[PDB]
């Protein structure tokens, strides 16, 4: 489990490697510091699926989408 974008990055297991559209698709899902309960989606590089998480409403990172489809578009090829 290593992925690359333009320059490359490694982590700890084995399934044929992903050239990620954008680097942020491999960032951990981040709730941020605010306390709301917002259902959002992010790309999980280990299951290779877009998955649900709870966003607090502020800050965080780019691996965060309002829909399954919006997430596919950014973090999945064609």
């Amino acid at each position: 489990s290593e992925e690359d974008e333009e320059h490359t990055i490694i982590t700890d297991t084995e399934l044929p490697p992903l050239k990620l559209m954008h680097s942020f698709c491999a960032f951990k899902a981040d709730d941020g510091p605010c306390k709301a309960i917002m259902k959002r989606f992010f790309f999980n590089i280990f299951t290779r699926q877009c998955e649900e998480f709870i966003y607090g409403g502020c800050e965080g990172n780019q691996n965060r989408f309002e829909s399954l489809e919006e997430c596919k578009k950014m973090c999945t090829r064609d």
Binding site: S1, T11, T13, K28, A29, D31, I45
Partner: peptide, 20 residues
């Protein structure tokens, strides 16, 4: 970056806890 079985930031589940 995500690491094997750690796809969320530190304290995600503990903070989530408290919200729900």
């Amino acid at each position: 970056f995500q690491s094997k079985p750690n796809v969320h930031v530190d304290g995600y589940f503990e903070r989530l806890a408290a919200k729900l």
